[PDB]
């Protein structure tokens with residue numbers, strides 16, 4: 001690899017110089033002859049790291065941590081190295097200190113190349129839930145997380161971290177992909193009620209005993225697995241689920257569509273890797289960018305898919321695509337979503353503000369850290385791409401650790417007791 | 418190994434085998450992806466014959482005569498020619514096959530469903546800038562066709578020693594001038610200020626308006642470039658108006674009908690065609706999103722949103738997004754009303770998905786650059802947004818080359 005790589009912004013002419021890529025640790029999926037940059041998941045859950053694999057991964061993280069606190073090579077550094085090395089020898093694993101857990105979680109977010117919101121990465125509240133033993137305890141921790149992060153609409157980013165993987169047969173998992181999502185119900189006639197993306201998970205919940213109200217916006221129950229046991233269902237207390245009815249500043253009829261959305265985006269299916277340790281249950285939450293709701297959730301064809309109905313109430317020419325009736329309604333839907341969150345004082349960021357902040361963050365990271373891995377395909381918003389600054393920004397993508405990773409869906413790997 | 422690409426809206430999976438045939442690099446490694454970099458960083462006899470043989474082989478494979486007497490004889494003919502001249506000349510049929518396949522292989526082009534319908538004009542007998550001018554005028558007239566646009570390419574002599582290059586100095590055959598103003602601002606197209614200044618330096622008398630068609634600056638056989646005015650009756654233009662906003666016409670906006678790239682290099686079988694202007698028809702967003710609304714181009718969003726009386730005090734009103742959609746409605750409406758070929762990004766991306774299905778079936782894959790294929794507005798309501806794509810480099814191909822004013826030794 002070359003020692004310096006340059007990225008250019010084609011709107012501003014600013015050129016940045018990347019040296020951080022030299023620390024990349026895992027594969028991207030690309031090769032010298034093919035680029036897999038638009039593949040969503042480019043390449044068993046119970047083959048766990050051996051002692052020999054774990055030693056160097058732990059040292060690399062411990063070294064990175066002591067370098068970050070300006071104590072590299074110190075007595076405390078060498079003693080921590082020695083202590084970790086003994087633990088891996090006698091127990092095949094080790095335990096992070098609280099300071100290291102917090103450092104690791106913040107840097108997994110800092111390293112998340114697909115996240116446009118990383119200007120906030122150092123302001124993450126970390127809840128240590130490694131003492132948890134049961135699904136009931138996981139439920140308690142998650143409710144506390146939801147309440148803290150929601151903060152009556154003044155949302156605060158947060159992560160709750162459950163015990164790390166041991167042999168792979170005692171994993172903690174949140175089976176929900178997000179803490180708060182709406183059910184989807186397949187009808188005998190082939191139509192779908194609610195959110196079609198959640199039809200499979202809704203069916204699992206019903207089979208586990210959930211009684212479905214069968215409405216358009218039913219919050220799904222939590223399905224929580226502690227210590228590899230069978231998962232257990234819990235209803236989130238509805239007062240903890242902040243929701244926003246969607247209305248439009250100009251169209252009085254928009255409220256008559258009956259749309260609403262929840263305030264808290266909380267991803268619960270990712271795996272947190274710190275120092276070769278694997279935290280398979282690590283729900284984290286921020287605040288929404290408006291397009292995640294307005295463009296994807298509402299206007300994806302396989303989601304709520306409301307463009308047609310809004311276009312009809314806007315009385316648009318829907319016969320030919322070149323009228324841009326879809327584009328026109330899409331803007332109005334996203335105007336309504338931003339207006340509704342701001343009116344109810346629920347934190348939200350529009351795609352112009354978020355991408356402008358990301359460019360400033362990226363520039364600061366290039367100066368102070370030597371780079372900032374970024375996935376252009378994910379960072380550019382799903383509407384109005386070129387009128388945001390990130391469209392014109394060349395980006396380098398590479399995988400640093402600590403990191404968030406995908407993992408298999410737990411219903412596909414779980415051994416039912 | 419076979420690679421799978423999935424559409425996450427339709428769940429269709431396609432299996433790519435065609436990437437196995439590529440040998441040129443992408444810029445990525447196993448550790449760093451460079452998929453959003455715009456440009457990731459003369460041939461001898463020794464390099465030339467394997468490249469020629471590879472191209473002759475795929476040509477005769479394409480016409481189902483691989484290993485034939487014709488194939489074997491062509492290989493021998495090419496081998497002798499590289500020996501005695503350090504180069505070789507393509508047959509007419511090879512030139513046409515190579516230009517069409519350079520288009521077919523252009524991973525950044527959403528228009529490739531049309532690839533085999535390309536009119537190829539052989540200009541390899543040209544020797545002077547006056548001849549280049551003639552050939553380019555014939556191309557423009559043919560491609561424009563009174564608004565019923567036809568895809569075409571004109572191919573000038575190949576590179577020899579690098580000292581006698583043919584070059585069109587214009588980046589596109591038809592473009593508008595840009596002028597740096599005393600008070601600092603820019604009149605016309607800001608993207609062309611430098612090229613405009615070179616034409617002025619070479620004697621072009623600028624009208625100093627907002628939509629002045631630039632002259633052609635033509636370099637033949639490595640000589641100094643010469644200026645030519647494209648005859649105005651050949652330059653088809655569209656005044657932009659809006660189907661509902663009657664004030665839109667008062668903005669005084671226009672564009673030209675013919676998108677004609679003239680600064681790329683065409684590589685076929687090891688040969689380099691440094692002058693190869695090619696042209697198609699516009700996708701609406703090329704004009705309405707990039708040319709008009711890029712902050713570094715005509716940059717008209719503020720003006721339009723003003724006439725729409727939008728609240729511009731805060732980004733979250735999405736006033737930019739509202740004005741952008743109206744501008745792109747106007748462009749499509751205007752070309753359609755004047756019966757000038759244009760495609761909207763919904764129709765174009767749908768066609769590209771169908772093209773991909775075609776290529777995976779008959780060819781085993783289709784190289785495609787998601788970063789460029791997804792339109793600059795309304796991305797996820799077009800089907801390509803949800804389509805995984807593999808990007809890899811096949812030859813024949815179009816390549817970028819340095820601007821001639823950074824290389825030319827002026828005589």
Ligand code: HEM
Pocket residue numbers: 105109112114115116117118120124157158159284285286287288289292349354378404
């Ligand atoms: C604080 C405000 C935040 C904003 C505005 C934000 C914004 C976004 C957006 C728009 C995406 C793309 C989502 C999609 O299209 O599915 C994303 C992805 C991501 N975010 Fe952030 N995020 C925030 C907080 C966080 C936090 C607190 C974490 C972790 C501690 C995080 C980690 C990630 C990761 C790992 C991804 C990639 C997800 C994937 O590949 O599925 N983000 N973010």
Ligand code: HEM
Pocket residue numbers: 516519520523525526527528529531535568569570695696697698699700703760765789815
């Ligand atoms: C016939 C209608 C065509 C349409 C609608 C179309 C559409 C497009 C668009 C929208 C782009 C992106 C360019 C940009 O954003 O600046 C592009 C790229 C490209 N087009 Fe096509 N195109 C067409 C015909 C052609 C033809 C005839 C050729 C050559 C024979 C061609 C070769 C290319 C190449 C090489 C690129 C990539 C340029 C680069 O790498 O920068 N296209 N096309």
Ligand SMILES: CN(C)CCc1cc(F)c(F)c(CCc2cccc(N)n2)c1
Pocket residue numbers: 117178180181264265266267284285286287288289292296297
């Ligand atoms: C398929 N994809 C459109 C949906 C995936 C998806 C569904 C959700 F419910 C959801 F909250 C997130 C959130 C991603 C995220 C995390 C943190 C902050 C933020 N702003 N965003 C992502």
Ligand SMILES: CN(C)CCc1cc(F)c(F)c(CCc2cccc(N)n2)c1
Pocket residue numbers: 528676677678681695696697698699700703
């Ligand atoms: C980033 N930018 C400086 C490059 C601009 C650029 C460079 C190229 F080589 C190129 F082929 C095209 C294609 C534009 C085009 C061609 C034909 C039809 C059409 N509708 N459009 C555009």
Ligand SMILES: C[C@H](O)[C@H](O)[C@H]1CNc2nc(N)[nH]c(=O)c2N1
Pocket residue numbers: 038039040377378379425802803804805806
């Ligand atoms: C095929 C493509 O990779 C896929 O549709 C991606 C594109 N970019 C994205 N970008 C974001 N932020 N979120 C997504 O889900 C996707 N989906």
Ligand SMILES: C[C@H](O)[C@H](O)[C@H]1CNc2nc(N)[nH]c(=O)c2N1
Pocket residue numbers: 010391392393394395452453454455788789790
């Ligand atoms: C940095 C980035 O690669 C650059 O802005 C690209 C993004 N995608 C694009 N896509 C198209 N079709 N045309 C472009 O000029 C660009 N510019």
Ligand SMILES: [Zn+2]
Pocket residue numbers: 030034035036037445449450451452
């Ligand atoms: Zn890549």
